[PDB]
C-alpha cells in the first residue's frame, strides 16, 4: 500500500508484507530527491538537518519451546502485555533508528536585494522595447 | 556614436604596452600577498567552541607503550595486519568490532609501492554515545603500510579508546579505524560506508554504521617521544577544509606549549623585521605547488570528497634536545575531540577558499583573485585587437586534428601496453610513459601541412585566445593554484605567436612553455624550496616517476589532472603551434 | 518486554460513534500537552498517518475498522525531569511508599 | 495481532493498466475525420 | 520609477 | 519567567531562570500559577557531565533544577509571538488551561 | 539534396554515439536541461503509479498531459528512437518553410522595384538569388548541431515534441492551410500555455497571403478572422474533452495549468522566478506573480501595431520572448529561436555590440555546471553565485534580441529614404 505526499499537506506512507527466507539478509531501497524551501520555513538552526522518523517492524517469531495458556489475573505483569494466539510463536514489534538528512538552503540575509535586481532586469527589457516601439528615425 | 569609436582607436594605438603593464601587475600582486595589508590574523569565529573550556585528565602512557610492543610483534609474525589480536584487544576495551575485505586490479604494475593486485582487510570499532541515538559520528584513523611503522599510533589509539569508553557526556559516536594498505583501504572503507561505487573497488558489505560523519582526524607516529607536531591540510583535486579546524588544533598547541609546524617549517612569533617575508613566501609557494599537484597528501584528503572536515597529524623526532612524551599528544587529541563534541551544527561559518603564508595568517579569495584577473585582461585585449584588424574554410583540419591528437593522448597509453611489450623489449610500466612521450612528440610534426593568409591565422588566433581564456578561468574556480601557475606560464607566449618575424625565437619560446615543460620546472622548484637540490639525470628520473604516478592516481582515486591536461589544454597549445607555422 | 521509538509517539483508537475524527484528535493532543508538559501541539496533518494493517487493538475488540485509528511520532522531543514530575504525580502512593521510593 | 491471510485478501489483485477502448475509438475517428478534409 | 518615468 | 537563549554554551540564562523558579516555589506560589518558558534544555543535554542537574556555583552544593519541576513552553514553542499572546490573552482557542 | 541528407546522417550519428556512452546518466539529471514539466523519470513514475492503482495526479511529482501518457504507454521500449525521429522532423519542416518564405520575399521585393518606391542609390541592400540559396540548409544545421538540442535529445526531455509541434505550425501556416494551422496551434497550447500568443502573427500572414486588406471598415477581414478563431477554439475544446475520458477525471487540469501559472516548486533553473519566490515577503507574493506572468502576454499588441507588415520577424521575436520569460525555462526552448538567426544575417552591417554578447552567453553556458558543482557537492559556494550567473545569462539574451530588432528597423529606414 502506497500513499503519495502532497506539499505542506500530508506525508508519504509505504506498507509492505514480505516473507523472509531462512539464514539470510534482505535489503529494501528507494530513491529520493531533496527540495528547496522558502527562507521562512527553516528552523532557528537550519544547518543541523531534518529527521526521518524510525520505521516499524512487526512479526510472529518462532519459539524454541511451546507455551501453555495463561490467565492474566494470576500471571506476572510482564507476561500479559500482548494477547497470545498460538503457543508456537510470539509477537514482536521493533523500531529502527532515526535518520538525519540535510537540505540546500537559500540566503537568509538578502530578501531585499533580490527584488531590486530582478526588477532591474525586467525594467531593462521594458525600456528597450518601449524605446524601440515608440520612437522614429530622424 | 563617436564616443566609443574614440576609445577603440586609443586601445589599438596602445595595445602593446598595456599587456606588459597588466602582466607585471599580476605578478607583483601575487608577490604582495605576504605583507600585512593583505595578510590577516586568524581568529576563532565559532562560539560553540570559543566560549567553552576543556580540562584534560588522560594518563595512559604505559598502556599505550605495551599495546604498541604487542602489536609490532604480532605483525612481525603474521607478515601482515594482525586481525584476531586487534579484534580481541578492541573487544577487551569495550567496543563493537567489525571487519571488511577488499580487492582490486591495477591498470599496470606499480614500481613505487610494488603492487599489482591488492587485497586486504580493515578493522574498525564503534563507541556508541550512551545518552543519544546513532545519528552523528567522529572518526579517528591510523593508516598502516607495509613498512613496519605506526605501531605507537595504534597503541595510542587503543589507550584513548579505553579512556573514552567510561564517560557519559558524548553526543556523537566515535569510530576507531585501522586500514590495511596506506590509502587504498581508506578509499575502500569510505566507498563501502556511503554505498557508492566511485572507483570500481570490490568489498564485502558493511554490517555496522554510526550515522553521518562530521569530522575526522588521521594520526601518524613512529616513536615513543616527539620533538614537534606537523599538520597537513591539502586534499585531492585541491580541496580544503574549514579554517576553524586548523584554528582549533593551533589553540590546543599553545595550551600544552607544544612545537607546532606547517609544511615542516617553524614560524616566528611576530614579524620582527624584514626576515619574516622570505619565510612567508617560502611557505606560500610550497602550499601553492602542493595544491596544484592535486594529490591526496594523506588519508584526510580522501575524506574531503564526502563534505567531511579532515585533519592529519604527524609527529617528528629530530635530535632536538627537548622531548615530549606520549601523554602530551594524548591530551592534545583528547582536547580536540572534546571541543568537537560541543558543536551543535555542521561547520559552516569561517572560510572554505583561502591561502596560508603561515600557521596563524591567511588570505581570502577576494584578496587574491586580481592576480589572475590581470592576465585574463591580457588575453582579452589581444583578442579585441585581432577582432579589430580582422574587420579592417581552412580551420576545420587544424581543429579536428588537434582534438583527435588530444583524444589519442588520453586513451592510447594504458591500452596497447601488452602489444608493445611483446614486439619490443621494454617492461610494462615504462611502456605507458614511452607511449605518452611518443604521442606528445608526434603531435608536433604537422601531418596535413606536408600536403602541398591573413584572415585564416587571425581567425585561428582569435578562436584559440577565447578558448584559452575560458579554460583558464574555469580551472581557477576549481583550483586557484593550478590556474595561476598555468596562466603565468602560458599567457605571454600565446600572446606573441605570429607567422611573420623571428620564427625561431617564437618556436623556442612555445616549446619551453608547453604543459610538459611546466611540470619539469615545477619539480625543480619544489626540490629547490625543500633545500635539497637536484641534477639533470635525477630530475629526468623524477619526471618519469611523476608521469606514471599521475596516470595511476587518475585511475585509482579519481584525480583530474591527467584528463584536464590531455583532453583540454594540449589541443589549445597545438592550435597556437598551428598558428605559428600556418602553412 | 516492551520497546518504543526515540522522541514521542501517540496512537489512539476511537469509538465508532465519533463523527469527526480529526477535530477530536487535535483537541485530545492539545489536552494531553498540558498534562504531560510536552510539545504535543506540534502534531498536525504533515506528521499523522492512518495505518491499514499495523497497530491493531491491544484490548477487547469486536470490529477493527482502521477509519478510527490515528498515529504520530515526534522524533526530537526531549525526556527530562520535567516529564517525570507529572508522571509520578498520577501514581497513588506518589513516591512516598512502596517501589516508588526508588525513582530518583 | 498480524493476521496474514486476511491482510493478503483485504486488497484486490494488481492488474496492469490499459487505455479504455472508447478513448482509442475517439482518437482515431477524430484523426481520420481530419484526414478526409485535406484529401477526400 | 523605471516604468512610469517614460509613460505619463 | 522566560529564558530566551539557545544552544549549550548559553547555560547561564537557563540557570538564572531555574534559580528564580526554585525561590518562588519555596516561598509558596503553586506550580499552576507559574508560566515557565525555557528555550533550550540544559539539564538533560547529552553534553552535560552531570545529567539532570544545573548548578549556580562551582562548589556544586545547590542544584537549581531540583527534583520537582514543570515547564509549560518547550524549546520550539518559545517565541516573541507566543509571549505576546500569553500576556494579551489572544491565544488559540484549543490551548489548555495550564499554558495561559 | 545531398547536403540535407548528409546533415541528417551526421546529426543522427552524433546522437546515437552519445546515447551509448557513460555521460547519458550525467546529462539526464542537469537542472539546465530538464524541468518538473519535462523529466523522463517523472514519465516512468506516473506509468508505475497507474499500475499500482493510484492516480498519477494525486501526488506532487507528475505534471504531464494524458496524451504523453498514451504515447509513451505504447512506446516505452522504443524511447530513444522517438526523439531522433522528432528532431529530424522539426529540422525538415523548418527547411521547407524557409524555402517557401524566401520565394515570397524575393517576389515581393521584385514587385516593389517596378513600382519604383525605393530610393535611387539603395543597392547592396537588395536581396539577390545567389545569397538566399543556402539559407534553409543552414537553418537546419543550426537547429540540429546546436549543443542545446543534442543535450535535450540525450536526456529524453519532452520539450522536443513541443518544438516539433511549433515547427509544424509554421510549416502549415506558410504553406497556406488554416485548418491544419489551427490544429497544430491548439496542440501546442494544450501542452504548454504560452504558445497562444502566436495566434496574431499567423493570422496576419494568412490574411496577407489572401491579399485581403487589414482595415477596420473591411468585410473579408472580419469573416476570415472569425472563422480562424472558431476553428482554433473548437480544436482546444475537443482535445480537452477527449483528455477527460482517459482517466475519467478533471485532475490533470490543476496539475498542469495551475502548476504553470502558480509556480509552487522552487527547483533552480536558468530562469528568473525560483530565487525571487524563495526570498519573497508573503504580503506581496500574489501581486508579483500576477505582474511577472502578465509580462509575457504584454508585448503582443504593440508589436503587432509596429510589425504589421512583417509577420515572420514578429513570430521570431515572440518566440524569443516566450523562451526568456517563461516560468520553467530550458535550453531546448532557447535553441528554437537561435535556429532563426541565419534568416536575419543580411542585417549584419547594422548590428552593434554583437561580439561581446556572444562571448558573454558562451561564458555563462559553461559557468552553469561548475558553480552548480561547487554549491551542491563541494560545499564551498552558495546560491548567490548561481543566481548571478542566471541574471547575466538573461540580460545577455535580452540585449541580443534588442540589437536584432534595431538593425531591422534601420535597414527599413535606409531602404525607404536613401543610404
Ligand atoms: C554583465 C552584465 C551583468 C548584468 C547584471 C549583473 C548580474 C550578475 C553579475 C555580477 C553580480 C551582480 C549580482 C550579484 C549579487 C549576488 C551575488 C553575490 O554577490 O554573492 C557572491 C557571488 O560571487 C559572485 O558574484 C562572482 C562569482 C562568479 C560569478 C561571476 C559573475 C558573472 C560573470 C559572467 C561573465 C564574466 C565574464 C564574461 C565576459 C566575457 C558570493 O559572495 P558572499 O556570499 O560571501 O557575499 C554575500 C553578499 O555579497 C553580495 O551579494 C554583494 C552585494 C551587492 C551585489 C550586487 C552588485 C551591484 C552591481 C553589480 C554590477 C554588475 C554589472 C551591471 C551593469 C550592466 C552580501 O554582501 C551579503 O548580504 C551576503 O549575505 C553575503 O553572504 C554572506 O554574508 C554574511 C556574513 O558572512 C552571512 O550572513 C549570515 O551570517 C551573519 C552572521 O554574522 C548573520 O547576521 C546573518 O543573519 C546570516 O545568517 P546565519 O545566522 O549565518 O545563518 C547561516 C545559515 N546558512 C551569509 O551567510 C553569507 N553567505
Ligand atoms: C480567439 C483567440 C484569442 C487569442 C488572444 C489574442 C486576442 C487579441 C487580438 C489581437 C489584437 C491586436 C491588435 C489590437 C489593437 C487594435 C486597435 C488598433 O490598432 O486600431 C487602430 C485603428 C485603425 O483604424 P483605421 O481607420 O483602419 O486606420 C487606418 C490607418 O491608415 C492606420 O493604418 P494601419 O496599417 O496602422 O492600420 C492599423 C490597424 C488596422 O486594422 C484594424 O483597424 C483592425 C483592428 C483590430 C481590432 C481587434 C478587435 C477588438 C478587440 C478584440 C475583441 C474582438 C471581439 C472578440 C471578443 C468576444 C466577442 C463575442 O492594423 C493593425 O495594425 C491592427 C493589428 C491587429 C490584427 C490582428 C487582430 C485580430 C483580432 C482577432 C479576431 C478574432 C475574431 C473577432 C470576432 C469576429 C466577429 C465579430 O485606429 C483607431 O482609430 C483606433 C480604434 C479605436
Ligand atoms: C581588474 C580586473 C577586473 C576584475 C577584478 O580583477 C581583474 O577586479 C578585482 C577587484 O575589483 C576585486 C574586488 C575589490 C574590492 C573587494 C572588497 C572586499 O570587501 C572587503 O574586504 C576586506 C578584506 O580585508 C574587508 O573584509 C574583511 O575580510 C576579512 C578576511 O579577509 C574578514 O576576516 C573581516 O571580517 C572579520 O569579522 C570578524 C572580526 O574579526 C572582524 O570584523 C573581521 O576580522 C572582513 O571585515 C569585515 O567585513 C564585513 C563585511 O563587509 C564588515 O564590513 C565588517 O565591518 C565592521 O563592522 C563593525 C560593526 O559596525 C564595525 O565596528 C567595524 O569598524 C567594521 O569594520 C568588517 O570588519 C572589508 O570589510 C570588506 O568590505 C571583497 O571581499 C572583495 C572585493 C569586492 C574584490 C573582489 C574581486 C575583484 C572584483 C577583482 C576581480 C578579479
Ligand atoms: C577578463 C576578466 C575576467 C574577470 C571576470 C569578470 C568578473 C567581474 C565581477 C567580479 C566581482 C563580482 C561582483 C562582486 C560581488 C561579490 C561580493 C563579495 O563580497 O564576494 C566576495 C568576492 O568573491 C568572489 O566571488 C570572487 C570573484 C569571482 C569572480 C569570477 C572570476 C573568475 C573568472 C570567471 C570567468 C571565466 C572565463 C572568463 C574569461 C573569458 C567573497 O568575499 P570573501 O569570500 O573574500 O569573504 C566572504 C566569505 N564569507 C566570510 C562570507 C564566508
Ligand atoms: C572535469 C572534466 C574534464 C574535462 C576534460 C577537458 C575538457 C573541458 C575543458 C573546458 C572547460 C573545463 C571546465 C573546468 C573544469 C572544472 C573542474 C571541476 O570542478 O571538475 C568537477 C566539476 O566540474 C563540473 O561539474 C563542471 C562541468 C564542466 C563540463 C564542461 C564540458 C564542455 C569536479 O568534480 P568531478 O570532476 O567529480 O565532477 C564530475 C563531472 N563530470 C566529470 C562527470 C563531467
Ligand atoms: C603540469 C602543470 C600543472 C600541474 C602542476 C604540478 C605541481 C608541481 C609538481 C611538483 C610539486 C609536488 C609537491 C607535492 C606533491 C608530492 C611531492 C613528491 O613526492 O614528489 C612530487 C611528485 C612525484 O612523486 P614520485 O616521483 O612518485 O615520488 C618520488 C619521491 N617523493 O609529483 C607528482 O606526483 C605530481 C603529479 C604529476 C603530474 C602528472 C599529471 C598528468 C599526467 C599525464 C600528463 C598528461 C599529458 C601531458 C604530458 C605527456 C607527455 C610527457
Ligand atoms: C556546452 C554548452 C555551451 C556551448 C555553447 C552552445 C550554444 C551557445 C552559443 C549561442 C550562439 C549565440 C550567438 C551566435 C551567433 C549569433 C549571431 C550570428 O550568427 O552572427 C554571425 C557572426 O557572429 C559571430 O560569430 C560573432 C561572435 C564572436 C565570434 C566567436 C568566437 C568564439 C568562438 C568559440 C571559442 C571558444 C570555444 C570553446 C568551446 C565552448 C554573423 O555571421 P555572417 O552571417 O557570416 O556575417 C558575415 C556577413 N558576411
Ligand atoms: C619551466 C619553463 C621556464 C621552461 C624551462 C625551465 C625549466 C622547465 C627547466 C628547463 C632547463 C632547466 C635548467 C637546466 C640546468 C640547470 C643547471 C643546474 O645546475 C646545477 O646544479 C648543475 C651543476 C652545475 O652547473 O654546477 C640547476 C638547475 C637548472 C638551472 C635547471 C632549472 C630548471 C630549468 C630552467
Ligand atoms: C611555471 C612554474 C613552474 C613556475 C616556475 C618558474 C620557473 C622559471 C622556475 C622553475 C625552476 C626555477 C629554477 C630552480 C633553481 C634555480 C637555481 C637557483 O640557484 C641557486 O641555487 C641560488 C643560490 C646561489 O647560488 O646564490 C637560481 C634560480 C633557479 C635557476 C630557478 C629559476 C626559476 C625557475 C626556472
Ligand atoms: C491572455 C490570457 C492568458 C490573459 C492575459 C494574461 C494575464 C492577464 C493573466 C492570465 C492568466 C493569469 C494567471 C493565472 C493564475 C495565476 C495563479 C495565481 O496563484 C494563486 O492565486 C495562488 C497563490 C499565490 O501564489 O499567490 C496567481 C496569479 C496567476 C499567476 C495569474 C496572473 C495573471 C495572468 C497571467
Ligand atoms: C487528439 C489530437 C491528435 C488532435 C487531433 C485533431 C483534432 C484537433 C481535431 C479532431 C476534430 C477536429 C474538429 C472537428 C470540427 C470542427 C468544427 C469546425 O467548424 C472548426 C474546427 C473543429 C472544431 C475541429 C478542430 C480540430 C479537431 C478537434
Ligand atoms: Ca506551570
Residue numbers in the entry:
A (entry chain T): 415 to 552
B (entry chain G): 7 to 398, 425 to 484, 491 to 621
C (entry chain T): 103 to 206
D (entry chain K): 348 to 387
E (entry chain S): 527 to 534
F (entry chain K): 49 to 148
G (entry chain U): 2 to 420
Give me lines lifted from the publication on this model:
Eukaryotic cells are coated with an abundance of glycosylphosphatidylinositol anchor proteins (GPI-APs) that play crucial roles in fertilization, neurogenesis, and immunity. GPI-T consists of at least five subunits, namely PIGK/Gpi8p, PIGT/Gpi16p, PIGU/Gab1p, PIGS/Gpi17p, GPAA1/Gaa1p in human/yeast, respectively.
Here, we report the cryo-electron microscopy (cryo-EM) structure of the human GPI-T at a global 2.53-Å resolution, revealing an equimolar heteropentameric assembly. The high-quality map sufficed ab initio model building, with a total of 2,393 residues (94.4% completion), 3 N-glycosylation sites, 4 disulfide bonds, and 22 lipid/detergent molecules. The overall GPI-T architecture assumes the shape of a canon (the luminal domain, mainly from PIGT/GPAA1/PIGS/PIGK) on a carriage (the transmembrane domain, TMD, mainly from GPAA1/PIGU) with an approximate dimension of 148 Å by 141 Å by 83 Å. Consistently, our structure reveals that PIGT and PIGU form a platform for complex assembly. These interactions place PIGK at a “mid-air” position (relative to the membrane “ground”) with its catalytic dyad measuring ~22 Å from the membrane. Indeed, the protease domain of PIGK shares modest sequence homology (28.5% identity, 46.4% similarity) and high structural homology with legumains (Cα-RMSD of 2.3 Å), featuring a central 6-stranded β-sheet with 3 α-helices on either side. Combined with rational mutagenesis, the structure reveals an unexpected composite GPI-binding site within which a juxta-membrane portion of PIGT is found to contribute most to the interactions. Specifically, the acyl chains glue to the transmembrane region mostly of PIGU, and the head group forms hydrogen bonds with PIGT N461/D521/S523 and PIGU N383/N385. Interestingly, this composite cavity is additionally filled with a density that fits nicely for a digitonin molecule which also contains a polysaccharide chain like GPI.
